[PDB]
Amino acid sequence: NVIDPWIRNNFVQAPGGEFTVSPRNAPGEILWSAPLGPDLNPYLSHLARMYNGYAGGFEVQVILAGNAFTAGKIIFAAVPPNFPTEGLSPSQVTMFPHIIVDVRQLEPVLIPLPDVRNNFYHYNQSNDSTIKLIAMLYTPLRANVFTVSCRVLTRPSPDFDFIFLVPPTVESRTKPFTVPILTVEEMTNSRFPIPLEKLFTGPSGAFVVQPQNGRCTTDGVLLGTTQLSPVNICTFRGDVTHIAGSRNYTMNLASLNWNNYDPTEEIPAPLGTPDFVGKIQGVLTQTTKGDGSTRGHKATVYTGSAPFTPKLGSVQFSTDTENDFETHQNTKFTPVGVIQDGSTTHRNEPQQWVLPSYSGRNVHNVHLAPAVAPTFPGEQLLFFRSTMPGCSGYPNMDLDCLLPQEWVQHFYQEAAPAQSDVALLRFVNPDTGRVLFECKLHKSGYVTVAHTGQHDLVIPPNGYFRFDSWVNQFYTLAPM
Amino acid sequence: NVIDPWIRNNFVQAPGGEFTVSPRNAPGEILWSAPLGPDLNPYLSHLARMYNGYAGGFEVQVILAGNAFTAGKIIFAAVPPNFPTEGLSPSQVTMFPHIIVDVRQLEPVLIPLPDVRNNFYHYNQSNDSTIKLIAMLYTPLRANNAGEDVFTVSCRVLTRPSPDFDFIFLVPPTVESRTKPFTVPILTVEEMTNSRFPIPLEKLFTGPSGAFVVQPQNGRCTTDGVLLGTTQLSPVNICTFRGDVTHIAGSRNYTMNLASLNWNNYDPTEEIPAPLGTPDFVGKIQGVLTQTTKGDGSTRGHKATVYTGSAPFTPKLGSVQFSTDTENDFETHQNTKFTPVGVIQDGSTTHRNEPQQWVLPSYSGRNVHNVHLAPAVAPTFPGEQLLFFRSTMPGCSGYPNMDLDCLLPQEWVQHFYQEAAPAQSDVALLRFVNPDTGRVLFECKLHKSGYVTVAHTGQHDLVIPPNGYFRFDSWVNQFYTLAPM
Amino acid sequence: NVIDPWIRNNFVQAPGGEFTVSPRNAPGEILWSAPLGPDLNPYLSHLARMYNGYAGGFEVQVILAGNAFTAGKIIFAAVPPNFPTEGLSPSQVTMFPHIIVDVRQLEPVLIPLPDVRNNFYHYNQSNDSTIKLIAMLYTPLRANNAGEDVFTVSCRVLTRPSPDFDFIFLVPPTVESRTKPFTVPILTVEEMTNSRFPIPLEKLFTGPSGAFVVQPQNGRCTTDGVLLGTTQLSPVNICTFRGDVTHIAGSRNYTMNLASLNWNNYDPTEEIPAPLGTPDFVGKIQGVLTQTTKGDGSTRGHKATVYTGSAPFTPKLGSVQFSTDTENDFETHQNTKFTPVGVIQDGSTTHRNEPQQWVLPSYSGRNVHNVHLAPAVAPTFPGEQLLFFRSTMPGCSGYPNMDLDCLLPQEWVQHFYQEAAPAQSDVALLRFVNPDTGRVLFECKLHKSGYVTVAHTGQHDLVIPPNGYFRFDSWVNQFYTLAPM
Structure with missing residues (x-):
């Protein structure tokens, strides 16, 4: 029903609040992504670990640092969550809710972030947000070396609160299937x-x-x-x-x-x-x-x-x-x-x-x-x-x-005891840090691979095996 | 002021308070200790690490579970922390603040725990702190029944924040990743x-x-x-x-x-x-x-x-x-x-x-x-x-x-x-618990240098039960003396 | 808030309905199928092509025109989203929330549906499939007269959104096209x-x-x-x-x-x-x-x-x-x-x-x-x-x-x-269609590697009309099976 007032009134710095904006960067390209939510205000993030859901919004702030010698324009905006942002012009960005900034500003600047109070319970284990914050090189900022830096400041909305009291996550964990790190x-x-x-x-x-x-x-x-x-x-x-x-x-x-x-x-x-x-x-x-x-x-x-x-x-x-x-x-x-x-x-x-x-x-x-x-x-x-x-x-x-x-x-x-039938085990050669092959290890106690014919599997003898997760019984490997 | 009321109006299982009693137990001996403090509640632990200022007291509820055949009366109390508690007579524990509970009490009761009123902002981490907790049996527990080791009574401890509780200072928290628990294989030699x-x-x-x-x-x-x-x-x-x-x-x-x-x-x-x-x-x-x-x-x-x-x-x-x-x-x-x-x-x-x-x-x-x-x-x-x-x-x-x-x-x-x-100190402590008996037959003294010894004299071909696993426990110092077998 | 008053106030047609019923009938017969959504109303299909977020409901509204002395009834109903409806029972239609309607009512009829909502959103650029449409014949509507199949009874759909319905999110339009729509040759064997x-x-x-x-x-x-x-x-x-x-x-x-x-x-x-x-x-x-x-x-x-x-x-x-x-x-x-x-x-x-x-x-x-x-x-x-x-x-x-x-x-x-x-999901859906009747003899399960299976058992040279062709339909998951032959 209440959090600290000092948390609520003032702002705070975020773990994404960093920027290396050079003219050597390419114009019209994505340079910072971050899912919006509770995962951004740090003392709030630890305090919100224990609570299992949200109701409210946030306000963000931006703080910039450059010289009076270069001239650049920079955008921030908000998206649909599952929206592909990859093939995307910097021109069409502004149709989303957004605010442009110059290169030469002193005050902090907030963003609108239009709201629909969902009044649903965004589960903390899930990976889904409202948006993904974005930034893009709008004007390519040439001058005559220098690199520009910008940081992200943040707080929650006044009409934000919590839901429930829950014990710390992952208190008890089933044997996590530690594959040995050996070689064959x-x-x-x-x-x-x-x-x-x-x-x-x-x-x-x-x-x-x-x-x-x-x-x-x-x-x-x-x-x-x-x-x-x-x-x-x-x-x-x-x-x-x-x-x-x-x-x-x-x-x-x-x-x-x-x-x-x-x-x-x-x-x-x-x-x-x-x-x-x-x-x-x-x-x-x-x-x-x-x-x-x-x-x-x-x-x-x-x-x-x-x-x-x-x-x-x-x-x-x-x-x-x-x-x-x-x-x-x-x-x-x-x-x-x-x-x-x-x-x-x-x-x-x-x-x-x-x-x-x-x-x-x-x-x-x-x-x-x-x-x-x-x-x-x-x-x-x-x-x-x-x-x-x-x-x-x-x-x-x-x-x-x-x-x-x-x-x-x-x-x-x-x-x-297992958590599904087929596991996801990967032969990673740490000399490469790259997977030569994966496999399909079954919870009965045997393993199979979608590879053709007879092959003595020539592998680097320093390579280890890296188990990942539990796959369903309906996946086919790509062949080598 | 700063805590949600579901904490401030309930109780919570102890983080480690778990102890049994026995007919083989004897009055006067200690049973279970704990340093009282904000460390005794998981919720208060996680909602305390993000803070630094600290004040107030607590309350302790307790609950047992016992049948009707076993007769015994039990005692908890408070003590100033530096006090040596080794062979205290059970009768003199009258003089501390305390309560008696019968073992066949089916309903939970609560420790008084009078506050010292010398709070003055404890530093929120110091193990040199206030009252310890004492578990003790008042009565001989004649416990007579035809069962074997029977009606071994379980015990649980609950905490609660006091109404005059608070925090004072704010701070970004720590990450605190974790190390290895020093597991050993559990085979037979x-x-x-x-x-x-x-x-x-x-x-x-x-x-x-x-x-x-x-x-x-x-x-x-x-x-x-x-x-x-x-x-x-x-x-x-x-x-x-x-x-x-x-x-x-x-x-x-x-x-x-x-x-x-x-x-x-x-x-x-x-x-x-x-x-x-x-x-x-x-x-x-x-x-x-x-x-x-x-x-x-x-x-x-x-x-x-x-x-x-x-x-x-x-x-x-x-x-x-x-x-x-x-x-x-x-x-x-x-x-x-x-x-x-x-x-x-x-x-x-x-x-x-x-x-x-x-x-x-x-x-x-x-x-x-x-x-x-x-x-x-x-x-x-x-x-x-x-x-x-x-x-x-x-x-x-x-x-x-x-x-x-x-x-x-x-x-x-x-x-x-x-x-x-990576080690936590020099020499480790490994036990041969035979899981048939659940008891130690011998111990060892395992250095971080990569060798092991025991304080037993003469030549000894150690004959063990072949069903025996080995139980690592803790970290000993360079000055501990084992007991001979 | 986001939408025009007039488009919400009154009802507007739907282009898939408008269909006529001849008196020669067999009851318990499905007449017309459709998926419900905002793509029903052309107004709303445009406006949902414009936007992203999609929440609320509709009011499906049906007017009849034709004969009066038939004494024959019609059913409109709900359905499971994956449900075969070809020769099935009308009692299944009675399990769902449905409405019986005779031709004698002058007032246009409205079938209510299940009322739910998922307040975060619904995708609207997906399958996002929901309760499809049921045009079900109750009573075979004989039209006893001197004429043969006279007064072909028409059935229209003319809807408007529910008053809670509204949009939230807006995107650039990008109205252009899909990928290759997976066209098939229409040849025979x-x-x-x-x-x-x-x-x-x-x-x-x-x-x-x-x-x-x-x-x-x-x-x-x-x-x-x-x-x-x-x-x-x-x-x-x-x-x-x-x-x-x-x-x-x-x-x-x-x-x-x-x-x-x-x-x-x-x-x-x-x-x-x-x-x-x-x-x-x-x-x-x-x-x-x-x-x-x-x-x-x-x-x-x-x-x-x-x-x-x-x-x-x-x-x-x-x-x-x-x-x-x-x-x-x-x-x-x-x-x-x-x-x-x-x-x-x-x-x-x-x-x-x-x-x-x-x-x-x-x-x-x-x-x-x-x-x-x-x-x-x-x-x-x-x-x-x-x-x-x-x-x-x-x-x-x-x-x-x-x-x-x-x-x-x-x-x-x-x-x-x-x-x-480029493929859209795991298994495509192709139907061998006899265009002499416009009806399917059997369907298929085409896998994205470039092969295809069918859900039947045994040695069968599949008998086909030599005028029969193949017609691609949709993208089915890898766990739905087909009907055997």
Whole structure:
């Protein structure tokens, strides 16, 4: 019902009150825009943060500063709010309500600002005003260096007041979806502990894309065979059993902490098992439980083998030795590099798109996180291209994963429920400050781009990713 | 005069006044404090910061919520602010201005709060100010019912401006942007990885700082995210080797011009002790060396051995020897890659000897000392003991020194790089709240220099509940003494 | 305040009404539709073209003239702003605020409407659509007499604004024009020709989008005329080839040094998938190869069998193979031209196979695929089916896959090339109108990329009156669906 009288009677300076008027400026051009309203008188603006709507007008004032040597004329006026002001002559400006000024004046000058007391509640969250103030170079002001300066002074109308008492805005904010500021060269693969080297796009029809390492909710519930620690992907911990004469070892599996694994849970597998058929030379490693004598020897795992049964609790490893790893020790498979010890096929393995035998070839992998494809058509998925090492043979080392492993943990620390389906995430290279590409990250937990064909996405390795907002499910990217 | 009447004729929830009581509570002890002032109302806070002049008093309403079974009578009062209130008898709190409330009072009541009438224009910011508020239980609260921790009574505080309230002086306000809240990851220590070797940690350790000379170079960064030491961000790049081997024509060894994470050629001309991810202590470790042919991609694998105490190990110069079980399979100038997993104890009679974690390697060989040292660590506030992360590396042939005590968690480094937080004082306060019990098992003392300690004596493998998150609280000074566990 | 007294005091006509009712009727029938607004009164349409701000209401006022002894009634009503009203129920009209009126009243009748206002403004330079007009027949008004359809009962509208109505904002007039008003050709399917083969079109088709990989390269252009794909202007330039054949002296083949439509020598370095007029499918086709010697005109012509699924078909590289029926007749380095007539089926022993109308051929060969791909189409607001243009290509050998579906009408592409129209919203609205009755069989959903869908399901060769044409209407959003067939 009342504000400070000292606020009401006198004027005040505004954050837009500045002008660099040179003859080097082009005549007939816009040089200051500002939406009129509460957002202009500063002490009034903070005092009006808490109140949620308006009834009244304002009066503005102008104060100029130049020399007696130049001669210029300058206009101020008011517009419709949504009115395009871009293609606009300085001639036709004066048809709007307006006041022209000279270059050589002393007193402050007010503007009419014609009023229709709307008596509605201009909501402070919204972006709409009555007008947008304007200024334009009317006479080009040549002389014989000098630059002219002008400032904006302001107060509200006497018949202005407020509406309601409201608590400070944004007191509580939903996790604001802090995307990590990393690069994909810094981030690692979600299907193997290896740093991602390139970014790939392509069709989902070329494969069946349903892995189980790299599956989680956007708000942090444990999904698939995805777990937390990246090094626990495709390593093994359990209790090997000696085959009598062969190089094999069937291993009664355990946990990360060598705890007794429970096969009776609602899980696809032990958390950290590979989700693909593959042959890989690694190193099975064992120490004595009595003193701690370490030993590590080159081993080969077969996730397309029938004794590989993690959901049952046995897994086969073909080592270079035959009886070095004792039974029921701390025996632990460390993968090194995928080999191609199968015929002469080029890039046959790991079979990254088929599912392995968790419960064996008798019972399929249970409790499976589903597959994905661009359901919004015209777009292609975002694959994270890798290339695994190898010591002997040339297998298909191109590993395309879907998530960053650190992003799973980071968004677990978020544990954020979404605000729409599709987010607005932008790869900004801060060397440029420019977006190379945007994307369509879905609140299920996967991402798509409207780009054509197969492309290894050549990007500056200093570039980060910049999330913006929550888009509806009906937007199509422009192609690159 | 200057406030709208919806403030001047109502009440408002406290900004922080929130406290419970308990049958485990005891009479005489304190419950809840507050400095009275205009800071106790959010509306008056925001409509005060834009002003400077200040006068008047307040009123305080209060409200409880209690059942009929629990019996108790409660007490609030006023006090002059410098008064020491430590072990006051509840009966002497009679003499202050005060009111008694029964706990089963269903309706709100109001504190009297007599004004001192020594107003004379307080300076509107001074914490050295008038009356504090005191929360206290008068009665023993026998509270007898068959429930467990039951009828834990909630309590709320309300404020109100007095009728003789005002402001006096006008001023443009401040912007006051905000900083970082010093968040830490909430994992278990056994889930986080070692930062001087790519392995997950196992357990938390403490021990005397005079036992070892502790200065590694992997796991060295600021508390606001500027790259230090030989420390990089990707944990698989630690202790691995990548580059182009050239065949020594007779032995199982090669000379390898070192390569990056993404096989970029190593630059010896940077302000670094070593390449990023170099093994920062002397050891013998048997992982595996692989090589991908640059023509087709024939994946080969042969188990290797690296020797960080060897003279041909020269990371800063650009050649390190590797002794694989094969002699010359790894072809000329290809992408050859060593990945370590576990340490063996071979070629050395000494048992439980390698790796030697508290020495520094030969980065520029045995010729030039390691330059640009991120410095060693020792407790400034004496008597305390440093916090290690003890784990166990795999051991295949022999009995090596598998005791690996690193100084930092690797995920914390990237966490803090995304934080990039400027400190508020020197040493932080982190708690191990086990969320199963919701209670502390131990604390720490985390410096802004980038290391952490605890005031506990002797060697201690800290056995924690594996469901335990970690709870940062606040900023301690350089003179706080922890309690021993 | 802003307006003249006289224009507000009395009622003034409206140009859209004035319409007559013959006694031969069927009740429950809509007669006349109109959008309410200030563009009703020509006075007010001028004055609102002058101004910006728009607030208040009207009074619609109706006078009848004709017979009296009919005993037949009329309804005027409100409506939802997007409401189909063709064959619907009059009970719906009874739900809205409406008025029943018989012809026996001498006083002119007025229908009241919903009374609201939005006091900030209403745009007035937009759609700004509101309650449209309802001319609804209640009782079929038989006019029992000796005459046949005598005293055709006229119905006028003669309005004036409500006394609260007024303007607020004024703009420069800028009365001039809109953009291109998105004019359409009025052709039929026999008059329009195929945009992927030089043949006249036969029938439009609707069918499921999941059937084939729907991505051609002939028949691709924007809604404002930028060259996309291998699409060019002339319909006869499609699938025909020009250049300098080279003697494959042992076989019927001829590799052609590629020349353009104007016989300009081909540049293989342009930002194109293929040359202009090049096909975008795999199929075998017999047409006729023709060659005229540049010196005097020693003419020759023989039937050539072409394969865009062949290895020497490399239009982006600059060579293309033609297997004629003759072997050494066509001289080298002459102006040699192939023209097709219809796809054949020499075949792989499979009938109705070629052209594989949805696959892409070897533009730069099989090794590197095509570049600058105009993308595929998809129903973005789904449940709706695409628009195909079902045709039948001729043949010279076998049983070819004659069902030819193209994407755009070739006349409409060059029509838009003349238009160069910028879009106003997402989806335009085109109506296939039978001008024999002036009524629409089906509508469409044209997307601003340059494709169009319809909201129906199933395999339908759409039956059309061969006198039927197409008539553009408006701009609909991307979430309204059409009525199925």
